[PDB]
């Protein structure tokens, strides 16, 4: 999966990802963009689901940006892609 997470990783280092097929072709534009890896972005993205479900729909940045381990910035990208496939 991850061996040594540590230093700047460029875009190649995603799309080399064993897992960068399962993107559908705007999520693998976010990958490139917030520099995430299929591997770990799969992990915190069935979470958002298996939370998602639980309450039934009251997921927002407030929570999100806590819920999932990242940056700040870096959440609000992934919290709107979920909109924009009208998952919420």
Known sequence: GSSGSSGNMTISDIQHAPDYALLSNDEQQ???????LPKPYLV??????????????????SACRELLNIDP????????????????
């Open 73 to 88: 910035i870096k959440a609000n990208r992934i919290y709107d892609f979920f909109q924009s496939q009208n998952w919420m």
């Open 30 to 36: 976010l990958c490139i963009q917030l520099k995430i």
């Open 44 to 61: 915190l993205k069935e979470v958002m689901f298996r939370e998602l479900l639980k309450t039934g729909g009251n997921l927002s940045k």
